[model samples]
Target: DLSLTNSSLMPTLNPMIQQLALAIAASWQSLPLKPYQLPEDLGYVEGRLEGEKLVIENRCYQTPQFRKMELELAKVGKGLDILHCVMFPEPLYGLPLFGCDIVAGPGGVSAAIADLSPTQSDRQLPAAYQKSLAELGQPEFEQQRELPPWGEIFSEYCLFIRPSNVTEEERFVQRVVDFLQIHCHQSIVAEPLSEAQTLEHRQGQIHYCQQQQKNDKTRRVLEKAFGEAWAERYMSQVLFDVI
Candidate 1:
């Protein structure tokens, strides 16, 4: 998190933009979907950065599913954590860490790019090269590992989602938050509405259309339980707050 020293004019983008970018990057890295399936071999490891701060650089033999997932995530938000990707034809034992530095910091289109760009430390080689070379004794069961590892041809990409204005950028982030709430709250509301209708209809007209109905009194009880849950989940937040 970059901060202004004294009264010096800070960069245009809000410090929070950095946080949002990191969150979006994290979602890309951790979405529960498995990237592939391989015969007999089974293992998976959802990778994430060591901190919530900006990412410097990263490299991996890209999986189609992983790449696709990253794209899908990007479609939902602008910030991206992925920088570069590559793949080998077969399982290779040796590991390598390459180095590169691209400096960046606050504001404007170009500035946003630079602000989100990699740092010198980001590209610094692993201090313990032997650790990079060490191999896992055994693989764990994971969906990502199940997919066949790409051989020779791998891709490399860069991500930078820095914004230009602090106060203004927060508006966009708020929209993002609202978008997420709509999906989550709508689902919560829909379930309760369906339940409420079920209870109302069953008591007033159970035999009126038993032949047409698929569920039973179980729905009525479920409706009430879900009703309470929905209230606690959403309505409770604004129960008394009014315009």
Candidate 2:
């Protein structure tokens, strides 16, 4: 359903990340979209990391309530593959941010996360989302990792797991799909925010982006593949650019 995910990038990627990447893109098809152009060099990026190839591919689009919906898939050498997606909501619409990501490799999947993060000062999920997510059961997994210190923006419904086997990986994918589908449908019915509400929500998003940019692991890998300045540029301007 999504024609742009791995269209230009190399097909070499992890099965876990690859499957989730496709599912992520497919879930977004319910929304109406227009292309959200990227910088000249950021669309299909390639570099080398410690003699192994490093590649990052992106697909970006915009819906009515979302200013940008970016899906990024990256492969680093033979050891790691990544899936990162974020649907950034416009401040005018009182909608939560939608994001999901995974880090997997030949060793196995280390982390996978999906959430409809709050964009309100109250730090609580919207009423409808709260009720919907409450109705869903937590997917079974052997281990549940604690949230990062900078992860306060995430909703209570957030799912983060260390999937050790194929079955666990499949469950993670399905749960993420559930989250995406719910958020996409809910986004359409969200009401417009007042001027004061809009300002607060915008700041909430800026805070979320700034915190996500502090993920040192991402910066470290990118720094190795590219350089210090290039890594910082990608993080601030591309990966977690604040709107």
Candidate 3:
């Protein structure tokens, strides 16, 4: 069985993100809705960065239902370990993308942002949908408000949490699981978008992809690890291929 408690592939890398990835993959597989293709080990790098130390590990998957699903974990020597996972559904479904970005390191430093980002429009979601998320996410949202603001790009349903203590870490993990449950339920029951709606949804997704392409943090890391040209190719072809 693909388990979350598996040993870390890299010493500097944290198992938290790997655990999350396993949970997510397992959840999707259990749904038995659609089969996804996890490509052969792709974009694996473990070497010194400028004679320092670094580990860049990435996993990519795709399915008829999803345009692309990616999980990445990176660490620079003893510095912070950044873990990111994003999944883009097929355009016809008009489903929101699942996104989670986490930064964890020494001194109990941790930050997380998890959300179901809309791909149809930037306007507020329907009352029913928002209410569902608000109920499931309220505790996390309240806790998030107390944390130092960092991810301004997050949607309203996002949970941006910086746990101040170990207790908060437990809450954060449950919050993430709860959020994923709700998201998966929605995805399973999501109706297909109308032709007109698909057009708008396509455009909205393109806009989102464009914004991510311009993200300074992503660009800096990719450019530093791989060249600028390769980074652009990866961003356009693999990362934001839906757009």
Native-structure RMSD, model 2: 1.8
- Model 1 clash tally, residue pairs: 19
Better of 1 and 2 by lDDT: 2
Candidate 1: segments with Cα more than 4 A from true spot: 1-17, 25-31, 35-67, 71-164, 180-243
- By TM-score rank, best first, the candidates go 2, 3, 1
Measured on C-alpha atoms, candidate 2 has an lDDT of 0.83
lDDT of 1 by residue, 140-206 (tens): 2111111113211111211223344555345434433332232223222332224444343233222
TM per candidate comes to 0.22, 0.93, 0.79
Cα lDDT, model 3, residue 121: 68
Report the lDDT tens digits of candidate 2 across residue range 68-163: 889888888778888889989998987888998888877788999889999889988788888888888766789899898988778888888899
Lowest-sum lDDT 10-residue window in model 1: 68-77
State how far residue 18 of model 3 sits from its true place (Å): 4.5
Cα deviation in Å at residue 23, candidate 3?
A: 3.0
Looking at candidate 2, what is the lDDT of residue 137? 78
Would you list the C-alpha lDDT of every candidate in the order shown?
0.24, 0.83, 0.64
lDDT of 1 at 190: 30
